[PDB]
């Protein structure tokens, strides 16, 4: 069926499938020789594959995600393609495996009891936001609109590096969506900037649920009449200011990812 790409093909005999991560399905694996320098050395990776019940369209979608990830290329702050198995057996798409799970769960697990101080300092929270902005800036430079940026879709490595997940998926989390996406089904880089603002609020609530209480029904009317989430407790005004800029009704009045990187850089340099 599928052509052999010599830049990406990985020997499936050097890939040891382990415990499922989610169910098409994603399984944890040991890969031998992901570093050509030390070809004996093992590394933990994630493998995406189809289930037997999968249609021709399911396969086309996984081929599309593989091909878009090859073209976008690699960055520190995205979940990178590592290799593929396309020959004499099922399609495997091999990617980086982030040890510490998604950013939502990482933050929620590090909530202190009541009003005590948590292990997560202001500079570490701002660093999380900065790394996600750097990842989105890169994806934007590779003509990639995410469409579903949220803390659940950012993963965390052993060394607390943020990696944007699921940026290559083939075409409802309404609480993350820009009004033009809600009402007009239009997704742009500036729609992603709105979602980044919601993610910033998730970071400074240590994984809070957005618009808490307000049912999806009343959200659309709230946004139309100029209302937005309130400054979360202990969130400095500079960072609430950035959230509110991301939530301007006019896409052109929202900051660019370049301006978000620069703004978050300025906060980190000031500490
Ligand atoms: C790595 C060790 C481990 O088990 N990590 C773990 C444990 C619980 C939850 C999570 C989210 C993780 N990390 C983790 N899970 C999945 C993952 O890759 C998924 C994936 C796939 Cl398979 C993909 O295929 C094309 C594309 C992706 O985004 C570009 C992603 Cl995120 C990575 N890390």
Domain ranges of the chain: 1-97, 98-269
Secondary structure percentages of the chain, helix, strand, coil, to 5: 40, 15, 45
The CA 220 to ligand 1 mean position distance, Å, reads 32
Q: Are strands 92-96 and 81-85 parallel, antiparallel or unpaired?
A: antiparallel
Q: Is 208 annotated as a binding residue?
A: no
The CA 89 to ligand 1 mean position distance, Å, reads 22
The single residue of 148, 166, 184, 192 carrying the catalytic annotation is: 148
Q: Which atom of ligand 1 is nearest to the CA of 167?
A: 29
Q: Which fold has domain 1-97?
A: Phosphorylase Kinase; domain 1 (3.30.200)
Q: How many CB atoms lie within 10 A of CB 155?
A: 25
- C-alpha 147 chain-centroid distance: 10
The CA 227 to ligand 1 mean position distance, Å, reads 35
DSSP state of 102: B
The contacts of residue 177 (CB under 8 Å, 6+ apart) are 191, 194, 195
Method by which the model was determined: X-ray
The CA 5 to ligand 1 mean position distance, Å, reads 23
Please determine whether the domains at 1-97 and 98-269 fall in the same fold group of CATH. no
192 belongs to the catalytic site: no
Q: Helix, strand, or coil here: 232?
A: coil
Q: How far apart are the first and last CA of the chain?
A: 55
Tell the residue nearest (CA) to atom 24 of ligand 1. Answer: 48
Tell the residue nearest (CA) to atom 10 of ligand 1. Answer: 101
Whole-angstrom Cα distance, residue 233 to residue 198? 15
Which of 64, 165, 166 has most ligand 1 atoms within 8 Å of CB, for mutation?
165
* Rg, the chain, Cα only: 20
Resolution (Å units)? 1.9
Q: Which fold has domain 98-269?
A: Transferase(Phosphotransferase); domain 1 (1.10.510)
Q: Is 51 annotated as a binding residue?
A: no
Sort residue 234 into left (φ over 0), alpha (ψ -120 to 50) or beta.
left
């Amino acid at each position: 069926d599928l052509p052999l790409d010599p830049l990406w093909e990985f020997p499936r005999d050097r890939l040891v499938l382990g415990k499922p991560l989610g169910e098409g399905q994603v399984v944890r694996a040991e890969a031998f020789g992901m570093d050509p320098a030390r070809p004996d050395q093992a590394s933990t990776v994630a493998v995406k594959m189809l289930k037997d019940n999968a249609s021709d369209k399911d396969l086309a979608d996984l081929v599309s995600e593989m091909e878009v990830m090859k073209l976008i290329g690699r960055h520190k702050n995205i979940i990178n393609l590592l290799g593929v198995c396309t020959q004499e057996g099922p399609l495997y798409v091999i990617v980086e495996c982030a040890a510490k799970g998604n950013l939502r769960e990482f933050l929620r697990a590090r909530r202190p009891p009541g009003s005590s101080e948590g292990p997560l300092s202001f500079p570490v929270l701002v660093s999380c936001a900065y790394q996600v902005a750097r990842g989105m800036q890169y994806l934007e430079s590779r003509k990639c609109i995410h469409r579903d940026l949220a803390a659940r879709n950012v993963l965390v490595t052993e060394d607390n590096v943020m990696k944007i997940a699921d940026f290559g998926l083939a075409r409802l989390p309404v609480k993350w969506m820009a009004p033009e996406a809600l009402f007009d089904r239009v997704y742009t880089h500036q729609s992603d900037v709105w979602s980044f603002g919601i993610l910033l609020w998730e970071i400074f609530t240590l994984g809070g649920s957005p618009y808490p209480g307000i049912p999806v029904e009343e959200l659309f009317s709230l946004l139309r009449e100029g209302h937005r989430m309130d400054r979360p407790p202990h969130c400095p005004p500079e960072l609430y200011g950035l959230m509110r800029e991301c939530w301007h009704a006019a896409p052109s009045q929202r900051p660019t990812f370049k301006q978000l990187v620069e703004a978050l850089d300025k906060v980190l340099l000031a500490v």
